[PDB]
């Protein structure tokens, strides 16, 4: 038969369509799912990425410092206690509950929740509480937002079903199955804002299963914002999530110090056998070298990060960047390759902090050609003349022509007018646009300095500055020629 | 009420449309013969 179109790349998973409510003949016929081989969880790729080294690589003194500062809990004790007490009471009373946690990035939400469920699993290993199943659902790690329905049911039953069948199965399992035939499930919903669809059915279902009497379900919902339910969710879901919500504040600088010095307990103020032939250092031709990080360097890093964000990732990356700068300076002076006392002091931390804060924008427009800077200068002149923050391109063409023909006594303009309008030939006729007109316009568009409107008339098309006018004039004043006229 | 519906089907409960002329004093066979004359002329036209 003749097809109107073809779908030759369809890849369909092997997932059944029959839900759990039809799996048994009656409610009384459902067995103990805890005593089932495939229920409640009762790494095939990790050998793929291995090879032989055939080399002994050099690990300098700063390498152990840089590995100790990677993201891969002295300051989270009240939040740990609250989350642990709520989850513990819900587990050992066979209750269903929702624990809401919100915060800015890198303040330790995921780490605290994972340590809470680790200590809960340790409690259930010694029979202080009934045994439970732990499930992680990250909303940013799903292809489709409905795949969470597929994931949780697969973690509960071992079945592979499609998403509507999975959510029917989960609805039947939480609602109708008796408690004595079930197990407690703790579900971490990480990145909750990613699980928000147009119709909020996933959020309603996940928080409404926690209001079922038989469910034995605990949902730990981790969100960006305290008032995410009030901003983006319905009143029923906001009622079901609750009024009691746990805020993870940004870290103060004493806590960022505590985190960094907890990362630097075993190598800060310690000795190394350095082997100055290669620089490969071994922790206790060969010298005993003390390594230290300055406490005031950690102080200024922690103070800057705690004022700006309180992010632990940012503080660890700042200290790691400082160690990288010190290691680059160290390997420059010896030529150690990769195959006394060395200190990560204040200035490395300051150079690491300022390299994220210095702007390349003014440096970028400084090193442009004459024609691009002439474009920017004419656009600034038109912006101050007619007061508009949006200028027609034909006006910019006429302004460039006017600035060339008015400042015709300038020596640079005398030297460059023939280049700008004839490419210095006297065989090319006089042009209506300058040489490299479309080039510098497209260059300022790729850089994001300019915005242009989608019109096909070139003269009446408008152009806007996407950067600050003060930055543009500061760039234009650095040039010797354009600051004169 | 089906008058508030968009569409509905009806199956109602349960021989020529020509009526008796001459102030109601036409013969019944004149009516039938008029019906057949119209039918033959209309068929001969179409």
């Amino acid at each position: 038969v003749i097809r109107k179109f073809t779908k030759k790349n369809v890849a369909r998973a092997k997932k059944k369509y029959t839900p759990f409510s039809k799996r048994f003949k009656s409610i009384a016929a459902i067995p103990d799912l805890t005593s089932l081989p495939e229920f409640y969880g009762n790494s095939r790729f990790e050998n793929k990425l291995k090879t032989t080294q055939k080399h002994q690589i050099v690990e300098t003194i700063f390498s152990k410092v840089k590995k100790q500062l990677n993201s891969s809990l002295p300051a989270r004790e009240n939040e740990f206690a609250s989350i642990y007490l709520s989850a513990y009471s819900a587990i050992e009373s066979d209750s269903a509950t929702t624990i809401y946690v919100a915060g800015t990035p890198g303040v330790g939400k995921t780490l605290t929740v994972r340590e809470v469920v680790k200590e809960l699993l340790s409690s259930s290993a010694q029979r202080e509480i009934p045994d439970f199943l732990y499930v992680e659902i990250n909303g940013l790690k799903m292809v489709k937002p409905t795949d969470c329905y597929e994931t949780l049911w697969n973690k509960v039953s071992g079945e592979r079903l499609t998403w509507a069948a999975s959510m029917e199965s989960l609805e039947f399992y939480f609602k109708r199955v008796p408690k004595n035939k079930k197990k407690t499930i703790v579900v971490l919903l990480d990145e909750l804002d990613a699980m928000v669809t147009k119709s909020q059915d996933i959020m309603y279902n996940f928080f409404n299963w926690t209001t079922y009497e038989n469910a034995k379900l605990i949902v730990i919902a981790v969100a960006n914002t305290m008032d995410l339910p009030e901003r983006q969710l319905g009143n029923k879901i906001t009622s079901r999530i609750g009024f009691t919500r746990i805020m993870f504040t940004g870290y103060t600088h004493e806590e960022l110090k505590n985190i960094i010095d907890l990362r630097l307990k075993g190598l800060n103020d310690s000795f190394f056998y350095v082997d100055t032939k290669t620089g490969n250092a071994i922790l206790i031709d060969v010298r005993k070298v003390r390594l230290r990080m300055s406490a005031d360097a950690i102080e200024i890093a922690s103070r800057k990060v705690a004022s700006v964000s309180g992010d632990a990732r940012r503080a660890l990356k700042v200290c790691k960047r400082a160690a990288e700068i010190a290691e680059k300076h160290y390997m420059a002076k010896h030529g150690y390759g990769y195959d006394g006392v060395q200190t990560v002091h204040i200035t490395h931390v300051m150079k690491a902090l300022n390299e994220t804060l210095n702007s390349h924008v003014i440096t970028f427009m400084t090193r442009l050609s004459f024609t691009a800077k002439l474009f920017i200068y004419a656009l600034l002149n038109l912006m101050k003349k007619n007061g508009s923050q949006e200028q027609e391109l034909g006006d910019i063409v006429d302004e460039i022509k006017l600035l060339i023909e008015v400042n015709g006594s300038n020596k640079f303009v005398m030297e460059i007018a023939k280049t700008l309008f004839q490419q210095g030939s006297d065989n090319i006729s006089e042009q209506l646009r300058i040489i490299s007109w479309d080039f510098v316009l497209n260059q300022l568009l790729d850089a994001g300095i300019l915005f242009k409107q989608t019109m096909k008339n070139d003269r009446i098309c408008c152009v806007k500055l996407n950067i600050s006018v003060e930055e543009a004039k500061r760039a234009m004043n650095e040039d010797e020629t354009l600051r004169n006229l | 009420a089906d008058a508030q519906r968009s569409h509905y089907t009806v199956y109602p409960s349960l021989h020529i449309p020509f009526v008796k002329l001459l102030s109601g004093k036409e013969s019944e066979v004149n009516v039938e013969k008029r019906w057949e004359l119209y039918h033959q002329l209309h068929s001969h036209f179409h």
Partner: protein
């Protein structure tokens, strides 16, 4: 313990422990005046229940189905005592693919047998014509069709509520919905009052050996939770959090209820923690949203560099530094930053500043400092 048992009974998933909720004894009779009327005479009528969230609508209707009641055939004991026939189902409408399948969802509850294709009101009507049938529809708001104009959005609900009144068919349709999230007889579940919440709380706590709360604490919690949103879930959460704060910090009392409301709920203190350099940035930003009123960072920063050159107070700083102080005002709670397409001839995405801090307390904190008064 008893803290554990009180905490378990104060959850939203708690067990419902002759057939009316403890503060709902009016509305239950109203539903009885819908049931014992239309079950006996076999009429076709439609009920519609409204209310704010957590007013007991699902709980009361589930108690009615549990205690006072083809697959779902039951006996209804009449006030006359005839014990007449009724098939009752209860469908939450959110766990449904499309709204237009609800008629099919009505069939799969009331079917042993043959499986027919029902895609309209007509098929379900002609299936229910040769026979009564009671369908409780929770979350009626899910039947609305989005993005399909005002008339055609209510398409399925008009079909359901029209077939719910049609002659010689036997259909009672009870539809509960929530008012904040959105002819049949309308019954409203009003939000609970503090005396009703006290009644509910002592009746739920009656199964325990003792009540661990002081009663002024329970009445204070009930009064602080009631109002225009009398949501019982909020009161359960407040009392559960009071037990939790007691357990962490160690009868309950009033101070723990007040500490719940202190922990789980201000622009004077935010300004007072800032550096004079940071305080000038906040003054310029609210001044920047006076002239433009939809301005970017680079338009707010352009205004800030204007204010400095006519005043010469503090050294003028760079744009990136301006943004991190603006990011400093993110993490203390004054400046808010979003991203949307700008309104103009060019439509591409820009970052903007919005400010909602109380303006009454902003002018009080800044007029005390003399050098900042040019920047208001």
């Amino acid at each position: 313990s008893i803290f554990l048992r009180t905490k378990a009974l104060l959850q939203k998933s708690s067990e419902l422990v002759d057939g009316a909720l403890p503060a709902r004894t009016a509305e239950y009779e109203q539903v009885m005046n819908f049931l014992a009327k239309a079950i006996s005479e076999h009429r076709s009528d439609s009920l519609y229940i409204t209310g704010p969230p957590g007013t007991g609508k699902t709980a009361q209707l589930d108690m009615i189905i549990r205690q006072k009641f083809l697959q779902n055939l039951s006996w209804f004991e009449l006030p006359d005592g005839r014990l007449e026939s009724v098939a009752v189902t209860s469908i939450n409408c959110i766990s449904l693919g499309e709204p237009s399948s609800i008629f099919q969802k009505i069939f799969d509850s009331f079917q042993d047998g043959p499986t027919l294709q029902i895609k309209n009101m007509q098929h379900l009507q002609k299936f229910l014509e040769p026979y009564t049938f009671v369908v409780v529809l929770d979350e009626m708001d899910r039947l609305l069709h989005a993005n399909t104009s005002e008339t055609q959005s209510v398409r399925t609900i008009l079909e359901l509520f029209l077939l719910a009144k049609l002659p010689t068919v036997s259909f009672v349709l009870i539809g509960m919905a929530n008012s904040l999230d959105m002819l049949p007889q309308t019954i409203v579940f009003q939000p609970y009052t503090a005396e009703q919440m006290y009644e509910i709380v002592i009746q739920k706590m009656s199964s325990l050996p003792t009540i661990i709360f002081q009663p002024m604490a329970i009445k204070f919690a009930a009064k602080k939770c009631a109002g225009n949103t009398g949501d019982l879930r909020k009161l359960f959460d407040v009392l559960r959090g009071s037990i939790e704060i007691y357990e962490l910090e160690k009868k309950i009392g009033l101070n723990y209820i007040a500490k719940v409301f202190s922990k789980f709920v201000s622009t004077r203190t935010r300004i007072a923690k800032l550096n004079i350099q940071q305080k000038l940035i906040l003054c310029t930003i609210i001044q920047s949203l006076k002239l433009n009123s939809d301005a970017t960072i680079d338009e707010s920063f352009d205004h800030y560099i204007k204010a400095i050159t006519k005043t010469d107070t503090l050294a003028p700083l760079q744009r990136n530094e301006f943004l991190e102080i603006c990011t400093i005002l993110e993490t203390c709670g004054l400046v808010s930053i979003k991203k949307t397409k700008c309104k103009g001839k060019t439509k591409r995405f820009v970052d903007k500043i919005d400010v909602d801090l109380d303006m009454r307390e902003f002018y009080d904190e800044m007029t005390k400092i003399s050098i900042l008064k040019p920047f208001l």
